[PDB]
Amino acid sequence: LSEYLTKFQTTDPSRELNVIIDQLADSLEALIDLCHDFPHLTPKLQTQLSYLISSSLSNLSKDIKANLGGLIPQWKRHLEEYGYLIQVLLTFLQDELHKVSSNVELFKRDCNQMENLLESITKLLEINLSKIFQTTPEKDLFIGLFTRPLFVLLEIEPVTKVSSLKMFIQRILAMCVKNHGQSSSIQSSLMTNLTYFLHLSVFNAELLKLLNDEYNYPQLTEDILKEISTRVFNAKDTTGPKAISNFLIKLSELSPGIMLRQMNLVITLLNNSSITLRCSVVEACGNIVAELAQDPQTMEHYKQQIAVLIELLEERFQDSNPYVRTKAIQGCSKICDLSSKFNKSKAKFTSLAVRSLQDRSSLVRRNSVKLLSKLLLKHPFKAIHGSQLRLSEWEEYLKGSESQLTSVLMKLKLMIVYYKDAISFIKEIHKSIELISNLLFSKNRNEVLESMDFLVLADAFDIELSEFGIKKMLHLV
Amino acid sequence: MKVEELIIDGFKSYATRTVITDWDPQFNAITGLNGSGKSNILDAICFVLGIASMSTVRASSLQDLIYKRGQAGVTKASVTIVFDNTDKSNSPIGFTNSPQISVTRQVVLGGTSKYLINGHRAPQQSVLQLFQSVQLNINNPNFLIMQGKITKVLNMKPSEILSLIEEAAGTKMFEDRREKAERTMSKKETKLQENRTLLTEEIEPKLEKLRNEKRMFLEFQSTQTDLESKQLNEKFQELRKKVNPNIMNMIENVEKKEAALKTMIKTIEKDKMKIQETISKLNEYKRETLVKTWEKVTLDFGNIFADLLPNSFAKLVPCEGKDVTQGLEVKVKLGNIWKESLIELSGGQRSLIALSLIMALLQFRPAPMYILDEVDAALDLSHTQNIGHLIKTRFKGSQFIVVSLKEGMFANANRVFRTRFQDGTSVVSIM
Amino acid sequence: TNRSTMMANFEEWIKMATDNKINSRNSWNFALIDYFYDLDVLKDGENNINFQKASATLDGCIKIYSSRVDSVTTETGKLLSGLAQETTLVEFETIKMKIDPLFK
DNA sequence: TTTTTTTTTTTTTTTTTTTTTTTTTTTT
DNA sequence: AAAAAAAAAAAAAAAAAAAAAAAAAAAA
Numbered sequence A: 001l002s003e004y005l006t007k008f009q010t011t012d013p014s015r016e017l018n019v020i021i022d023q024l025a026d027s028l029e030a031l032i033d034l035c036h037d038f039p040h041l042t043p044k045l046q047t048q049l050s051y052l053i054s055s056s057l058s059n060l061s062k063d064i065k066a067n068l069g070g071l072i073p074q075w076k077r078h079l080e081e082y083g084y085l086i087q088v089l090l091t092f093l094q095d096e097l098h099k100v101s102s103n104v105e106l107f108k109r110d111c112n113q114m115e116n117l118l119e120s121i122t123k124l125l126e127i128n129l130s131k132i133f134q135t136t137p138e139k140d141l142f143i144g145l146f147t148r149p150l151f152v153l154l155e156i157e158p159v160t161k162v163s164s165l166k167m168f169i170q171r172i173l174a175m176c177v178k179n180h181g182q183s184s185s186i187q188s189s190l191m192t193n194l195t196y197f198l199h200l201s202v203f204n205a206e207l208l209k210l211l212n213d214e215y216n217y218p219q220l221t222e223d224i225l226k227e228i229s230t231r232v233f234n235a236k237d238t239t240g241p242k243a244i245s246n247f248l249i250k251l252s253e254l255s256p257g258i259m260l261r262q263m264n265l266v267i268t269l270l271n272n273s274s275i276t277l278r279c280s281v282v283e284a285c286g287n288i289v290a291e292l293a294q295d296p297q298t299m300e301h302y303k304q305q306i307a308v309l310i311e312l313l314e315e316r317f318q319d320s321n322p323y324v325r326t327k328a329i330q331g332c333s334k335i336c337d338l339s340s341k342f343n344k345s346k347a348k349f350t351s352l353a354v355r356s357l358q359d360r361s362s363l364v365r366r367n368s369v370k371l372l373s374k375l376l377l378k379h380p381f382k383a384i385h386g387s388q389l390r391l392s393e394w395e396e397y398l399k400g401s402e403s404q405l406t407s408v409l410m411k412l413k414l415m416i417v418y419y420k421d422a423i424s425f426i427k428e429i430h431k432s433i434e435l436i437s438n439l440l441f442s443k444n445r446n447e448v449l450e451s452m453d454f455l456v457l458a459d460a461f462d463i464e465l466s467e468f469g470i471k472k473m474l475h476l477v
Numbered sequence B: 001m002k003v004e005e006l007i008i009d010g011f012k013s014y015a016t017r018t019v020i021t022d023w024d025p026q027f028n029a030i031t032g033l034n035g036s037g038k039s040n041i042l043d044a045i046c047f048v049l050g051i052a053s054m055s056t057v058r059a060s061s062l063q064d065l066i067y068k069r070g071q072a073g074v075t076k077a078s079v080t081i082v083f084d085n086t087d088k089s090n091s092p093i094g095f096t097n098s099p100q101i102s103v104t105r106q107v108v109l110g111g112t113s114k115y116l117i118n119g120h121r122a123p124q125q126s127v128l129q130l131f132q133s134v135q136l137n138i139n140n141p142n143f144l145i146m147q148g149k150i151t152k153v154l155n156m157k158p159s160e161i162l163s164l165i166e167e168a169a170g171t172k173m174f175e176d177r178r179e180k181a182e183r184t185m186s187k188k189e190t191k192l193q194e195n196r197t198l199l200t201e202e203i204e205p206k207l208e209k210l211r212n213e214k215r216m217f218l219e220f221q222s223t224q225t226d227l228e229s230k231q232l233n234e235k236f237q238e239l240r241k242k243v244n245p246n247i248m249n250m251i252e253n254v255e256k257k258e259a260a261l262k263t264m265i266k267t268i269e270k271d272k273m274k275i276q277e278t279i280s281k282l283n284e285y286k287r288e289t290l291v292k293t294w295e296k297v298t299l300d301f302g303n304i305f306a307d308l309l310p311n312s313f314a315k316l317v318p319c320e321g322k323d324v325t326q327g328l329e330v331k332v333k334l335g336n337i338w339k340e341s342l343i344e345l346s347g348g349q350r351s352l353i354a355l356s357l358i359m360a361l362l363q364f365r366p367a368p369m370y371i372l373d374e375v376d377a378a379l380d381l382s383h384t385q386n387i388g389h390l391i392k393t394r395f396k397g398s399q400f401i402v403v404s405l406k407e408g409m410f411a412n413a414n415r416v417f418r419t420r421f422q423d424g425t426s427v428v429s430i431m
Numbered sequence C: 001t002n003r004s005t006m007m008a009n010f011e012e013w014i015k016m017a018t019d020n021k022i023n024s025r026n027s028w029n030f031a032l033i034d035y036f037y038d039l040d041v042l043k044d045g046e047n048n049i050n051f052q053k054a055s056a057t058l059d060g061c062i063k064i065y066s067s068r069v070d071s072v073t074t075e076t077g078k079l080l081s082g083l084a085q086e087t088t089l090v091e092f093e094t095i096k097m098k099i100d101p102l103f104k
Numbered sequence D: 001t002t003t004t005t006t007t008t009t010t011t012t013t014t015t016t017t018t019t020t021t022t023t024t025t026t027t028t
Numbered sequence E: 001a002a003a004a005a006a007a008a009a010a011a012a013a014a015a016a017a018a019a020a021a022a023a024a025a026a027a028a
């Protein structure tokens, strides 16, 4: 076995193929010799050989399932040569598959025999396989024989693109991490793929989501998050940071709750100078809060975590670069687009937007004005007493309430607090409208268009100073 | 190239968008009063080609090329030129499949020299190689004569005459590009040496460290299979410090990537050697190519000057003791006696010599266009008429854009553009 | 029929080099340096060197060389990244920014 | 209609090329 | 004594490359 792996790593057939078919339905060496010459042997017989080996492997898996002292060593040995042979098949198929798409009919043929071998390998892996390999090193080597070719194949981009093969590989890895106790090896392989490639972050995120949701196993993703937090990067490549950022964004958008557990340590990544990493962290926090605000049980469980993530979201508005501020503005926009609680956070967002309208970054200005527009569109002060706000009318109502002022006491207190909050919001909106009318004369076409849209929305939601901006817009001719 | 239309907007006198078309690809002449804008049209044509010397076309900086500095309302100055790629022989190497090529240069108070090719933003370099590939190298022109510089042609240094000769047969566009390639390769070798230094300095000790970590695992594996007693368990617990259970896959990946890096480095060195050898053989060839070009241009120059003036001759010779590659000078013979110094020649004679040299260069390899500004300033009426007739009849080949104030050349001009300063700006009309 | 394929590959590679579409990813796919070494491609019908084609080949070779150097550099960066295993906040004061139509 | 890919266009940072003086020099 | 070429270095300005956002065409 070990000598066979050492040799393999260091390094008219049709007549014998029919003989092997009949025997299966020193012959062992003949099959290996036949399988060793795939690059030269015709593509016709390869399909039949792959189908035959898949059928034999499925039959043996069914026999093992039916059975479960017994003939344990014999079955273990037979599975060992079958695993070696399927590894040889996988290596020879990824050979020239790396060559193609680097023609297309051969690509379809190779992919089809690949899904056949994937069903065969899933049928193999579905069994417990624990008692037959008593020693952990033997099990580790046997399953590495299966997994390493899978990662070498995932190195190829179309393999990751094709959904059937992607799903089969994800299922294989999920079953492994769930039952064979190889979380460390799988995590190391995934981290190597992430640090060496850019097209596997989405694959890793989807695999982690599948493992979590359909196996109740968050340990692998928690360990991956801890390792990502503790890693350090060099300035020259930035490809590792970019892949990590993409993986974090995808994981946040898919499954936020599980990653919330390790986000406390993940936050430490913000101290790095990586623009991509900082943007990914802030966008991940925003996605987590946005997709966790839906579940009242989730708020009741993670009030403190959601509060600290939101607080970091407001605090990250101050940075030298504009990109993290822009990502924080999108996070705030998602939060305010959510129809939920945290009117205090909404008021803080309003204050931050009106304060940051004067940023030197045109992108940040555009995003702040868009945030203010969405705030105007979905302000909480519209459930009762209409949806139109006016300074004089609100002041008159506040004065009337003050003049009129247990149950009645608390009702008046709540009404006064609501009116004061509305007055503050309207004053902030008036200041924002004045600043946006001043800023409208800007070079950026997108900025001008979005400021015009904000002014139109403000005029529609009748405001005393809105006509001012309207005149400014008339002046844009 | 056979330019067919020219668009000038906000450039010097032409403040309004003036589009001039119907360019006859045989002989185009521009006429008008003093200050009408003919030289302004030539300056606009020079602008789009990518001229760098600002003092050349009557200017000091990029701002004064706009109608009235940054003032008077006009803020941007754009010049657009459109050629014809019907003939693929005289076509850009990189744009043979794209007919009707267009080049636009725009200058703004804020921006600087924005270039568009076929509507797509392109760098200044891109248009530089685009125009150099069609012999329109305006930085060292071989077809461009400004106003008042016709009599100074014989006053240029022998190095500039050598550059003029090298502009033909593709000898130019090669010295500067080899120099730039050498600079780029020298700069890249610094980075290559840096990567090699990090490869041989830090990565290798890590290689021995991971090899030492590899042995530890081979033993620890046996220890585990026995454990699967108390002293062995204690030893196993104590040895769980540098076990690195996933050392095999990581070390295999590192070795594979290092092998790939070494192969790429070796192939890079091989490519460098091949490029150097190719450059050596190429310049060894261009030496003899320059020899042939010089001989042919000298013969054509002599023939043209003999034809223009019946009792004169001219030739191009190397220096007194230096070879051809050092420089080239002009020798003139009148009657049966050679002239030791060219400073005693007449202004008309100097203009005729310059025209004969330009026509010899055209006869060797005709440039796509030839632009002349006040070429007949020091020529009499008879010589002006003879030059115009010879351009119309015998030379042909290329497209001529000549600014003339005398009837001699534009009387028989195939196409005539007349300029008037009408109202604040300049307008161009047919005939 | 190798001549036609070589000419087609040469034309497409020169077009790509002119278009500035050569980068680190496609560096080890289009090797026109070999065609530069064999100068038969950049020759006319009279065994003469076409210097416009020579300049195009030199430009392509230099661009591919630079792209390959960048690829080697980023691979080395990846190797050190895989083998290697504050106060970014700034006060907001520095973030301040600090009649034409009718007049025109 | 929804999503992935192309590509084009927005700054920001760094790179390349210009033009300034500053001396240095030799033949008449 | 006296007139004009010429090598040399730093400051300013044009310009290219990196990186992300917006817009149009294409496949499921």
Ligand SMILES: Nc1ncnc2c1ncn2[C@@H]1O[C@H](COP(=O)(O)OP(=O)(O)O)[C@@H](O)[C@H]1O
Pocket (backbone or CB within 6 Å): B012, B013, B032, B033, B034, B035, B036, B037, B038, B039, B040, B041, B058, B064, B065, B066, B067, B068, B069, B147, B403
């Ligand atoms: N930057 C500029 N802004 C405004 N006017 C200009 C500028 N440069 C040149 N002009 C005007 O354009 C005219 C150019 O005349 P020109 O074309 O040289 O006449 P000709 O073609 O007869 O030689 C000049 O009279 C000058 O006053």
Ligand code: BEF
Pocket (backbone or CB within 6 Å): B346, B347, B348, B349, B378
């Ligand atoms: F100086 Be003369 F009129 F050629």
Ligand SMILES: [Mg+2]
Pocket (backbone or CB within 6 Å): B038, B039, B040, B147
């Ligand atoms: Mg003039």
